[PDB]
Amino acid sequence: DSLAPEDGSHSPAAEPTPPGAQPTAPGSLKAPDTRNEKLNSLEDVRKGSENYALTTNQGVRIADDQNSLRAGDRGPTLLEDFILREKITHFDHERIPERIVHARGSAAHGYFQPYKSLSDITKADFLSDPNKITPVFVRFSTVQGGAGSADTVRDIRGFATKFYTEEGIFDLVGNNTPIFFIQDAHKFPDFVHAVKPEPHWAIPQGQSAHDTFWDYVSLQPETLHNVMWAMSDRGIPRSYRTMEGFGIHTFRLINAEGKATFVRFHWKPLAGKASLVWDEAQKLTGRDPDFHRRELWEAIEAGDFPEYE
Amino acid sequence: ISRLGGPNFHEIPINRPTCPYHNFQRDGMHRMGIDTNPANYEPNSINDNWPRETPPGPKRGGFESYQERVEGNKVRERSPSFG
Amino acid sequence: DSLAPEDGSHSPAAEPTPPGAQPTAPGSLKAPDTRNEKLNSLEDVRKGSENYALTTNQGVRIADDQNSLRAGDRGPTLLEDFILREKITHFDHERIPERIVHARGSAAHGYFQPYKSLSDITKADFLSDPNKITPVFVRFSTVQGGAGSADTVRDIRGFATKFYTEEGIFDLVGNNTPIFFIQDAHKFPDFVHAVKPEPHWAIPQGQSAHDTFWDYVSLQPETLHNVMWAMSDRGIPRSYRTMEGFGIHTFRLINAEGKATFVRFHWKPLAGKASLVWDEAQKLTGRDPDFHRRELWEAIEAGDFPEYELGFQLIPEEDEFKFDFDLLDPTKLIPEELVPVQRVGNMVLNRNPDNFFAENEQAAFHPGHIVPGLDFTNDPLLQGRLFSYTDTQISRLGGPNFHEIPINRPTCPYHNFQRDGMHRMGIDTNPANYEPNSINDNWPRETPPGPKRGGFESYQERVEGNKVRERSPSFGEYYSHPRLFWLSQTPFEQSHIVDGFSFELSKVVRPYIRERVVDQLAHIDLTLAQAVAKNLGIELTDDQLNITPPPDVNGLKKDPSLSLYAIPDGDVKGRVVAILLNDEVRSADLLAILKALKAKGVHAKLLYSRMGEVTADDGTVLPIAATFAGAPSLTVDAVIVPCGNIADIADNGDANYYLMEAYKHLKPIALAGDARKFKATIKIADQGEEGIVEADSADGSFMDELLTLMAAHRVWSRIPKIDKIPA
Amino acid sequence: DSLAPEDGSHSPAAEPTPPGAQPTAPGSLKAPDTRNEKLNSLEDVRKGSENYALTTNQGVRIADDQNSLRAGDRGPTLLEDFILREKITHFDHERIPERIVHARGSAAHGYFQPYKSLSDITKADFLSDPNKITPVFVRFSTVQGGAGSADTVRDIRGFATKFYTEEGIFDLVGNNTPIFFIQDAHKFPDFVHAVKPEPHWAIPQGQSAHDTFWDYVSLQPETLHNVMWAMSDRGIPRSYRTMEGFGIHTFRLINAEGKATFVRFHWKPLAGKASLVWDEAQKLTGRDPDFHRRELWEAIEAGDFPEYELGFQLIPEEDEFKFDFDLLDPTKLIPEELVPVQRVGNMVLNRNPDNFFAENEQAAFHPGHIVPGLDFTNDPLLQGRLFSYTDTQISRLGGPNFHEIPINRPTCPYHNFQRDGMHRMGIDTNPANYEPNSINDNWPRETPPGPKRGGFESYQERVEGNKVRERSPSFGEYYSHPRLFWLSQTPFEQSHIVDGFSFELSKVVRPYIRERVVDQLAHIDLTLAQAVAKNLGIELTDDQLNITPPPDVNGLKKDPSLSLYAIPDGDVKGRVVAILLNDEVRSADLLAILKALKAKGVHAKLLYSRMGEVTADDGTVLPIAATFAGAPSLTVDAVIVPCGNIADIADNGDANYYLMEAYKHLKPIALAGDARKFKATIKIADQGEEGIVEADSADGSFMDELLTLMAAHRVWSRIPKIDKIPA
Numbered sequence A: 001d002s003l004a005p006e007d008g009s010h011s012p013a014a015e016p017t018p019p020g021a022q023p024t025a026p027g028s029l030k031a032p033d034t035r036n037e038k039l040n041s042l043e044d045v046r047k048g049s050e051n052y053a054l055t056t057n058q059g060v061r062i063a064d065d066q067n068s069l070r071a072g073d074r075g076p077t078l079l080e081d082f083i084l085r086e087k088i089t090h091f092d093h094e095r096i097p098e099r100i101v102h103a104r105g106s107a108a109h110g111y112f113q114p115y116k117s118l119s120d121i122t123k124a125d126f127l128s129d130p131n132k133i134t135p136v137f138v139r140f141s142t143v144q145g146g147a148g149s150a151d152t153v154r155d156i157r158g159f160a161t162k163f164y165t166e167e168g169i170f171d172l173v174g175n176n177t178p179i180f181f182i183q184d185a186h187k188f189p190d191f192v193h194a195v196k197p198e199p200h201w202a203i204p205q206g207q208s209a210h211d212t213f214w215d216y217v218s219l220q221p222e223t224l225h226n227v228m229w230a231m232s233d234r235g236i237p238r239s240y241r242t243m244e245g246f247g248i249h250t251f252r253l254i255n256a257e258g259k260a261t262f263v264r265f266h267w268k269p270l271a272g273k274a275s276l277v278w279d280e281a282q283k284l285t286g287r288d289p290d291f292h293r294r295e296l297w298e299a300i301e302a303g304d305f306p307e308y309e
Numbered sequence B: 001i002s003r004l005g006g007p008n009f010h011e012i013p014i015n016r017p018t019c020p021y022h023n024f025q026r027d028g029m030h031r032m033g034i035d036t037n038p039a040n041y042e043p044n045s046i047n048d049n050w051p052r053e054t055p056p057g058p059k060r061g062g063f064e065s066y067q068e069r070v071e072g073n074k075v076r077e078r079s080p081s082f083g
Numbered sequence C, D: 001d002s003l004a005p006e007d008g009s010h011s012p013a014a015e016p017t018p019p020g021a022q023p024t025a026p027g028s029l030k031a032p033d034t035r036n037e038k039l040n041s042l043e044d045v046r047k048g049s050e051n052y053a054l055t056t057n058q059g060v061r062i063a064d065d066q067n068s069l070r071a072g073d074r075g076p077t078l079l080e081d082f083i084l085r086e087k088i089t090h091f092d093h094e095r096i097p098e099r100i101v102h103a104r105g106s107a108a109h110g111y112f113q114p115y116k117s118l119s120d121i122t123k124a125d126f127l128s129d130p131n132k133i134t135p136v137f138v139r140f141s142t143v144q145g146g147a148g149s150a151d152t153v154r155d156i157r158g159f160a161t162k163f164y165t166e167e168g169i170f171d172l173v174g175n176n177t178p179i180f181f182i183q184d185a186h187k188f189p190d191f192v193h194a195v196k197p198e199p200h201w202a203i204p205q206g207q208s209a210h211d212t213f214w215d216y217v218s219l220q221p222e223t224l225h226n227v228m229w230a231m232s233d234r235g236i237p238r239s240y241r242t243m244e245g246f247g248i249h250t251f252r253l254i255n256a257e258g259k260a261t262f263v264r265f266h267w268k269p270l271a272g273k274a275s276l277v278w279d280e281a282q283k284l285t286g287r288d289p290d291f292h293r294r295e296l297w298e299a300i301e302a303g304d305f306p307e308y309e310l311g312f313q314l315i316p317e318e319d320e321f322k323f324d325f326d327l328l329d330p331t332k333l334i335p336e337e338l339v340p341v342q343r344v345g346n347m348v349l350n351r352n353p354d355n356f357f358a359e360n361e362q363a364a365f366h367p368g369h370i371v372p373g374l375d376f377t378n379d380p381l382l383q384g385r386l387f388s389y390t391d392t393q394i395s396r397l398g399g400p401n402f403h404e405i406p407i408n409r410p411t412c413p414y415h416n417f418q419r420d421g422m423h424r425m426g427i428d429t430n431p432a433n434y435e436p437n438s439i440n441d442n443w444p445r446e447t448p449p450g451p452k453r454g455g456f457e458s459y460q461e462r463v464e465g466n467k468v469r470e471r472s473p474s475f476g477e478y479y480s481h482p483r484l485f486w487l488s489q490t491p492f493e494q495s496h497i498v499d500g501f502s503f504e505l506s507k508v509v510r511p512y513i514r515e516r517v518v519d520q521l522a523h524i525d526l527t528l529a530q531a532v533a534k535n536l537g538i539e540l541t542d543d544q545l546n547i548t549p550p551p552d553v554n555g556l557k558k559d560p561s562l563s564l565y566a567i568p569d570g571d572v573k574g575r576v577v578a579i580l581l582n583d584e585v586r587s588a589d590l591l592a593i594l595k596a597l598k599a600k601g602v603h604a605k606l607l608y609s610r611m612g613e614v615t616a617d618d619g620t621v622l623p624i625a626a627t628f629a630g631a632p633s634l635t636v637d638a639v640i641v642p643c644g645n646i647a648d649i650a651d652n653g654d655a656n657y658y659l660m661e662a663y664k665h666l667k668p669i670a671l672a673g674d675a676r677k678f679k680a681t682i683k684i685a686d687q688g689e690e691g692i693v694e695a696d697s698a699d700g701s702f703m704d705e706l707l708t709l710m711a712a713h714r715v716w717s718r719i720p721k722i723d724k725i726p727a
């Protein structure tokens, strides 16, 4: 009953390997020895597969997963085939709405550690002890395109970090430029509608290069600063590893004595800052629309972990 | 699908089997189970075809319908015996 | 308060205009006088905008749509700002789930009209009289990629038509190849999961070129027939206008006397069959991921309406078992040499939607939506489809009232005892919500079946057998149809199939999967298998070289109707030519070029190294449509270079590459006067070659030769020359 | 194929008819001539039924709606039965989430008209012209129970009015008491969770009589004021027609000069104030859980329209701080003795919906739906309400397009740049979906504020303070308003409050909670506290007996407007009388009875020991409406027994109990001729007593005396006599 090759060449080595040397794999199979508190806490919902019987969602073993139940082997399919209907029902409802913005994104697990206690300026527990390790989950993204759009478009990039701290989840939801296009949230649907595919025909995907975007820009000069960044090579990063991150807004740090300090957040890439050039980026959306997602996944599989200060 | 919000209603705790369940179904709203199978289809070679079908048998076998004989034309008709 | 330009140049003309001549627009503003019964019935939900106040959804006029309400102009935003919250709430919930498959699609309104009454073979009302005009809504699609994926991927294409008939909605939900990959609907999630992005990392988008797809194929030889089609140039159509459509399954036509005839449905494109080549298609997903969506919309705005002839392959009930294959097997085609396609009517797509989301995204097609005069068969793929297309709408469209979404509404009457459900629009006045009832005199009432305006009754097919989960043995043949397809292609089409398999298998990381697929190809044709094997560094064994080929299909050595190009059918109307300008164009050349193109309905785009204008030798001001890089040769069907100051562009890398890319992609190229110096960049000798038009000046003969080349689509004889071209 | 009776008795007459005379029907079939702008605007979604074929939702006629498609008439059902699957799918998804609170409610259409222009104090367009008619849709409700819970529970009632104005929808979302239980919206889930069924076992339905509610009350004295109202007979109204309505919060009116006036909204019932008594209300939840829904629908079918006068309490901005309590505290009422209610206009409810689910269940009211001329205040309960009523519709009504559900649609224009979302009905043609735009000349456009037809601008209230989660100290007083309410009630109303607390606390299992509530009552009034304590077997301590009462409210020791009954306001129109028949009724009695009731708009129910008919002494055939047990005295306002063959019913247990129950519940009873023998059943002396009408015959003053009793609602003087009745 074995369909795997006898030489075992179907299974990727569970050790760091360079891009293309092995098939890519789920993280807990590729790197079983990598752990953190969050990864450990997900074990209760991880599901295996090897050596298990194929079942319905109700736990009933399936004998023939190749055929519908019919009245004769050339007959009509019967309504009483609950195995078919459960399998097709689940398939029929697989999709959930994509994010309104930043629908295209690539994510990884990791950890954060502060260099020293910041208790003089903030009572935040995750910043209180250099030995305190906080698990993170990070998602990098474009802004305009759908979940099935291309990576190397000209766009702003999102850089969202979920810190699983001992005193609650802290999400630092930033972008790869230090400002945004607009001043007041009331205008967000206007700006986003202008940059998104135009409503009559739903064109263009992953591009601000169309009338409605530049119409809005020309009528809203507050947008010009972030437009400058988007039109620069900042808009076409070489990799999620080679871009900066910013929280954009001024927030506050609050210490134990009640003192507030204004703060803006920054991520500094250990790999440095690097971008493509336009002709390359555009052609690459055709040759490999998954280039950034792939590069992130493969760097981690190689042990070449993305790092950000 | 409407009452419980989608196709993962078997993951709501009261509905969960206490016996094993494994298959190639994926995703859907409020998906709890995180599948590690490299494959989400069968037949597959990349996971040596697991999880695997099980032939019917006296115990722990796969489900097979009783091979009742069906004979008749396709009709929307009540059986006279019900009348 | 007016932000529009004083000259009115913001507003597109409400008249047919060629691609790029005007901004595109909602269909009811571009073509307000194009009407049909369905389009007219949508007027109750169309919303205008001009001269109206900006309001909340509750009708309250907004005074300041630029600012949130705050405590001081530098203060915190207040929870009482209901205008902000309503606007952001609506934004926050704009997205609905995309279709599980065929998420990427482009749609248009049109109409269908039969050529004659089909009453002798079907009682379907929409086919009963050549005077019956039926509105349609058609959505073309890819299969694998998301709604935001690219158009010109290698994939099967969907071709779904909603017929708004006087006796109900009929949805013909087909594809652009005559078979499907699998035999039984129970396997659909397996096949789709295998072709879709792999579940760990969600790669690759819009591509079958990955391990899991070819793993499934190698283990399920039933897939090989449709795989052959996908690896051919059928997988990369030039336009939705230049592909065929097929219902795939055998259905039944039922006439008034109750006689059943088996039928397979066909759409024949008036524009002919035409496809890209792989390198062009792949690069075009980067240069313009919206290319097919754009070309469909712009053809309709130009008056180049997509047209498709509906055809039926008809097989009497008594002939069910007269072929080498099972009629109910959706992995088998019916060769036109054995059963001709009888043309029965024509469909014209003549208006774009107003709002993509409301009309395209929310449209629900389902092959179970049939009408009296049609019926199903036991095809086990069709049988399971019947369950899926109603089920899936409960999440995708939010509940069981999806038929009340305007695009989905029948134009004929509908009345029943169904009630409630999320977003219920219809307010029922019937005292009864059940039947039988006396309190409403049993209305609405059942209708017996009959020749016209009768109730639906299934054809009383005899069913005999035991309840089994079992594939019919008649379905267990996998190689003869792939071989018939292979043998029916031209030599260059065969080369492109080889290159398709070779490219895709090269992207499979696990080598044994490649080897298993090559072994399957050896069961189809050894020339195909050896050619793919050579490109993969695989050597066939002596055992593989001795595999007996499968038998012919009912005596057929080939069927040229399976080739895109063996029988010429192309027409140039609606195609487009790039014209590469210089700063002092020979106006006489351009006059003759544009006159000849206009006479044939071929569009032109004037390209230069910058935007703005250039002035011809006689003072004619020429407006520039795009730069060489902004509208690459990928987006056109041919390239013409008129004479003038050729020195202006002779050393321009983009201009030289424009011709090299077009040359590599087998497109016609025409060079007038000093533009013939560009022959050096494409390595064409002074004596010239077939496929490169050249003359001292552009003229009638010059343009006749180019338009003849365009009618043949591509210059296949150039293929031996392109491998040395660095492009 | 017609199942209706040949005599047409299945169809109710489309004319006003009294309760029970005809089957009830959808409003547009019962009263097609009753129209308003909103009702007319719904015609595009109303669906008929008569003379139409039964179809699928796709418009396909159904031939056999009695059977599934099967392989043989005794065979398995086939998956290809799309008619079955569509019908069952729709059934399977009929239900939507019920409202979090106020899930049980009953609704009607109507209209509002102001008495005079209020332009001096508000620019609200619907209040600008006495000739301007504003359509309304009103939903009355309970609070705690589910959509399937009973009407006549002890609870607060909701009173929600949707005004379809020319300048937007205004929703006045009020209750039947002038205060709420809590001060800050942050506590709303705590309070509601405490009153709702307890989470382990989901008991009790429709009742605050359980530990968690009284636990919360005992720990949150701010609740005591509205608790007092709920424990009074206010908690058990006779009908939605006989209760007051209140907006509770202080809002603002804004005039064209920008001047703000504080306002509290009031509804005054034309039918007067009237409530049940507890034993009656509780038993009625069993005998007819739909009593209030039924009475509302049947009053409208009878042409006896519920009417309510809108009134305003108006407080100038400079008087904000001149009261002992904070105007922004929703646990405090504004006594009418301090600020009179000024009459504003009248609302008439004159047509029932067609489909309860489509119009009632799907209606969305929200107090943030205001119009120019109105504004909010910093009331911290109102402030949080503004968030909830938009948010909750995303799940309840399936997404952000809930304003497109027909009942919710404005009748005035609504245009904006919002797009998409689930169930999107409107098809936007605007080239732009953003502003500012030039491509549509910036339409739809913002509108500056102005005297009429202007944009919404918030009143520029001064805000000064630090960001704090802190209750205003001015809110920290909890007992003076409960005491004012207590002191304003009649002695019998006070007894009913004592009995309400006593009964509810008896259902609290943990005795310490009862003791803690009694301690709170001792801070309100020691007479109340002692009487409740006595009924609970609790002895007040000396310390409790020495608690100083809270101060008067701005010098008031009572305000009679807080009593249901202190100032008579009852009108008998729309009430109902049970008439207990015998097998040979004295027809002269019955003629005098029925005609006197009819002249005052009082309905009658002819009751007997069986259904069918009886014949009077003169041969008149009398149709029986219900049996004694089938329409118990709980469902009527008074009981009349005419003379005749009294021996027929004298020993009937149900007939005797009918009188005992009505007697216990303080209802007027009238006995003519030999019917006076029933005085022995209710233990009434030969000389008679006030509240029992008796005479030799029903002529003379008999009916006037009974109608006078009915105008006073109940016979409160009878209370000492019922306290030992075995009934």
Ligand code: HDD
Residues within 6 Å of the ligand: A099, A100, A101, A102, A105, A139, A140, A141, A157, A158, A159, A160, A173, A174, A175, A180, A184, A185, A188, A247, A248, A249, C088, C092
């Ligand atoms: C008021 C609306 C609004 C405004 C003004 C912004 N966003 Fe946002 N953003 C959203 C509304 C939103 C959202 C609709 O809530 C999203 C989409 C789906 C989601 O979960 O959140 C989102 C997603 C989203 C993501 C993706 C998170 C993920 O990976 O899942 C990022 C990185 C940002 N945003 C970052 C920003 C930045 C840097 C902004 C400017 C400083 C910004 N957003 C303004």
Ligand code: HDD
Residues within 6 Å of the ligand: A088, A092, C099, C100, C101, C102, C105, C139, C140, C141, C157, C158, C159, C160, C173, C174, C175, C180, C184, C185, C188, C247, C248, C249, C330, C363, C364, C365, C381, C384, C385, C388, C389, C390, C392, C393
């Ligand atoms: C049992 C499952 C199943 C099977 C075996 C098939 N499909 Fe399908 N198809 C669906 C389940 C489905 C679906 C999940 O129900 C979709 C996705 C969203 C939808 O509305 O229907 C769909 C969408 C869909 C569309 C897009 C319609 C649109 O534009 O909205 C087309 C053209 C087809 N299919 C065509 C086919 C063809 C030609 C098939 C083989 C003969 C086929 N499908 C087999």
Ligand code: HDD
Residues within 6 Å of the ligand: D099, D100, D101, D102, D105, D139, D140, D141, D157, D158, D159, D160, D173, D174, D175, D179, D180, D184, D185, D188, D247, D248, D249, D330, D363, D364, D365, D381, D384, D385, D388, D389, D390, D392, D393
């Ligand atoms: C912050 C939460 C919150 C608070 C403090 C209140 N409510 Fe509320 N109310 C809701 C949250 C809510 C809600 C959850 O949003 C409901 C349930 C379903 C709905 O549409 O709105 C609702 C329904 C609802 C209804 C039923 C409307 C209908 O018939 O559909 C009425 C009459 C009221 N409420 C009245 C009030 C009054 C008079 C309050 C105190 C002055 C009050 N509510 C406080």
